Amino acid sequence: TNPHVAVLAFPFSTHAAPLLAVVRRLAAAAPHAVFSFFSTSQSNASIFHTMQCNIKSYDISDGVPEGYVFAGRPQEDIELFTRAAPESFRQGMVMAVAETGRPVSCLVADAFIWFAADMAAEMGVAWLPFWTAGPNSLSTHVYIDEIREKIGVSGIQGREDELLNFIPGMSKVRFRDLQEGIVFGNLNSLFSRMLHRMGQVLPKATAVFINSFEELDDSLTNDLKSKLKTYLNIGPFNLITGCLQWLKERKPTSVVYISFGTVTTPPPAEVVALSEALEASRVPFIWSLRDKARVHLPEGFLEKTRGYGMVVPWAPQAEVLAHEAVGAFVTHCGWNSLWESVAGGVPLICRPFFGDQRLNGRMVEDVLEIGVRIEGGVFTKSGLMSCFDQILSQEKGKKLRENLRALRETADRAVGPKGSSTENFITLVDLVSKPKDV
Ligand SMILES: O=c1ccn([C@@H]2O[C@H](COP(=O)(O)OP(=O)(O)O)[C@@H](O)[C@H]2O)c(=O)[nH]1
Ligand SMILES: O=c1c(O)c(-c2ccc(O)c(O)c2)oc2cc(O)cc(O)c12
């Protein structure tokens, strides 16, 4: 039969949306192929809220048993989803095959679904994992065993600012920048082991693809092409594809936008510190903050800032960052947020917490020079007031904006006609268009 592409999303943080974004592009480019998109019901309802006729979503189990009482651990939801997922995805695919009358001919999946490799082997189909983050984090996972050998697994105390310069393209990353589960944090957690296994199996993939462009870092691109069978940069996606009315009335490059993505919130003390910096400078602002976290705001803050700032549970982030009024972005250093700031030409103020956030912060500050660090890695009133001054009012911000304009032009060319990402996407279309082997 003609192709039937199974797509397995990771239904946490901002993983499922960019995967749907590529599927949309793939479905338009391969109109004879049908696509079956698998995530949790919560995840699907959110991301599917104009859809190519050849895509249908399917709700699979979140892995939570009927009468389950949460222990309240971190990564509990992820753990439950992950343990059930081999079976959940299988049953979802059974259903899609029965509905379409087409066997699965290709398996596209978030790289986090590492057992997809085994599912693809058992099915007799190609495995096409999507790395949802940066090539920097892709590279440390692929090098997991080598990194653990060089550094050791008994701690990095006294070595935090040592350099990972034994890895190509990674000369500027310090030991401390590494994600939990490489050399520190709980190396025995399900999540650490999932990532360890992923790292070992990615070199076996038919192709690994990523929301980035080759020319971001030539050496890193070349190194990864040598560690993986096929490595395909096909982004940045966002260059390919009452907040605004409020912004309309503000001066150019004057507004600070604050957000920590979908799964991060600063501790209450840093919430206080940021509110004090905003208030003391009287800088115009839009702060995307969880409604539940509003309880941590100092008494009086909302009332004192009412004339010049908004605190909202959700903003139209991409469009805010593309508005001429915005002059700085206080961020957790998530990958999707980063590229949205680049599209808008807005300099970053980085406060990384976990995962790949420290790697992205290092890239922003030391590699691309498109943003700054807060002194000491935590929010303080004075530290943030200084960053705002640097970016909005001083020569530093002029330079950062220049750097951003230059970076975005390179990125635009990667996704233009004859761009490296445009060419890589043709390659991926050809891979997903292949019918199943006989
Ligand atoms: O108020 C908000 C906060 C976040 N986002 C979007 O959520 C995504 C955040 O993804 P990222 O990789 O930056 O961080 P994550 O949420 O995965 O930790 C981005 O597309 C943002 O534009 C948004 O639209 N409005
Ligand atoms: O959604 C998550 C995520 O993407 C990562 C992540 C991303 C890139 C990496 O390289 C990495 O090691 C981890 O970590 C997480 C850790 C959590 O506790 C919860 C999450 O939801 C994520």
Structural domain boundaries of the chain?
Answer: 1-241+414-433, 242-413
340 touches ligand 1 (CB under 6 Å): yes
CATH of domain 242-413: 3.40.50.2000
288 touches ligand 1 (CB under 6 Å): yes
> What is the dihedral angle through the alpha carbons of 330, 335, 336, 340, rounded to the nearest 10 degrees?
50
Q: How was this structure determined?
A: X-ray
The class (CATH top level) of 1-241+414-433 is alpha beta
- DSSP states of 118-176: HHHHHHT-EEEEEE-S-HHHHHHHHTHHHHHHHH-SS--TT-TT-B-TTSTT-TT-BGG
The burial class, CB within 10 Å (0-12 / 13-18 / 19+), for 306 is: exposed
Tell me which of 32, 49, 77, 110 is the catalytic residue: 110
189 touches ligand 2 (CB under 6 Å): no
Distance 405 CA to ligand 1 centre (A): 22
Distance 318 CA to ligand 1 centre (A): 9
Distance 247 CA to ligand 2 centre (A): 32
- In the numeric block, the tokens 């941590």 are attached to 296
What is the position in ligand 2's atom list of the atom closest to the CA of 181? 12
- Chain CA centroid to CA 327, Å: 22
Q: Is 15 a catalytic residue?
A: yes
356 touches ligand 2 (CB under 6 Å): yes
CB atoms within 10 A of CB 157: 7
Nearest ligand by distance to the CA of 190: 2
Q: Do the domains spanning 1-241+414-433 and 242-413 agree at the CATH topology level?
A: yes
Residue having the nearest C-alpha atom to atom 3 of ligand 1? 261
Query: Dihedrals φ, ψ of 66, to 5°?
Result: -50, -55
Q: What is the token pair recorded at 209?
A: 């693809």
244 touches ligand 1 (CB under 6 Å): no
C-alpha to C-alpha distance for 27 and 5, rounded to whole angstroms: 10
- Report the binding-site residues for kaempferol: 13, 15, 75, 141, 179
Cα–Cα distances in angstroms (integers) from residue 398 to residues 166, 345, 371, 390, 392, in the given order:
34, 11, 11, 9, 8
For 25: left if phi > 0, alpha if psi spans -120 to 50, otherwise beta; the answer is alpha
182 touches ligand 2 (CB under 6 Å): no
C-alpha to C-alpha distance for 295 and 217, rounded to whole angstroms: 43
Q: Is 110 a catalytic residue?
A: yes
